[PDB]
């Protein structure tokens, strides 16, 4: 199903076509409100002057049973400020972008982290960037550190002299917990 259709290498960089390097990345974490890492890309990917400036959301997880939510505006959300937006990877509540060599490649987050609580329904809607909001819940114990990325690119969005930015999500997970008190 759409959960797992990994057959494309899709070699790409973090900055993509933008020439901005990691020294000038606008690195600010997802908001923390009642155990919810949210970094909504609303109004942060619109065409604007002095760009494209790469915007990176860093989610550092060190607690069990963590909920992570990411929002990207859809096409036509506001008049002529979100056209030609692209979402990478196309299946990104489950398939995630990982780093081998010096490239970003798609992989299944279930394989990287066991016990991922994928919610197929979020707010009675589908869980994908096709809705614009992605939702999943992390397990309470993680054996080893895992890093994966999500991409919300607005470089192709322009309005005369204005151009859109590029949105990146970096989720950084450290080991925590020992075991679950229960059955298997």
């Amino acid at each position: 199903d759409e959960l797992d259709k990994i057959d494309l290498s899709y070699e790409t960089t973090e900055s993509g076509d933008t020439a901005v390097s990691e020294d000038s990345y606008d690195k600010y974490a997802s908001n923390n409100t009642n155990k919810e890492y949210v970094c909504d890309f609303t109004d942060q990917l619109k065409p604007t002057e002095s760009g494209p400036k790469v915007k990176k959301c860093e989610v550092k997880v060190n607690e069990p049973l963590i909920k992570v939510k990411i929002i990207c505006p859809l096409k036509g959300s506001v008049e002529k400020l979100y056209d030609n937006i692209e979402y990478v990877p196309k299946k990104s509540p489950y398939v995630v972008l990982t780093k081998e060599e010096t490239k970003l490649k798609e992989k299944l987050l279930s394989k990287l982290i066991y016990g991922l609580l994928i919610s197929p329904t979020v707010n009675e809607k589908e869980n994908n960037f096709k809705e614009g909001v992605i939702e999943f819940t992390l397990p309470p114990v993680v054996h080893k550190a895992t890093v994966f990325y999500f991409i919300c690119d607005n470089s192709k969005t322009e309005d005369d002299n204005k151009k859109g930015n590029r949105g990146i999500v970096e989720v950084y997970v450290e080991p925590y917990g020992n075991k679950i008190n229960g059955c298997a």
Binding site: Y28, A29, S30, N31, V38, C39, D40, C57
Partner: peptide
């Protein structure tokens, strides 16, 4: 101010 993020509210 609150914790800086992609919201800043």
């Amino acid at each position: 101010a609150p914790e800086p993020g992609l919201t800043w509210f």
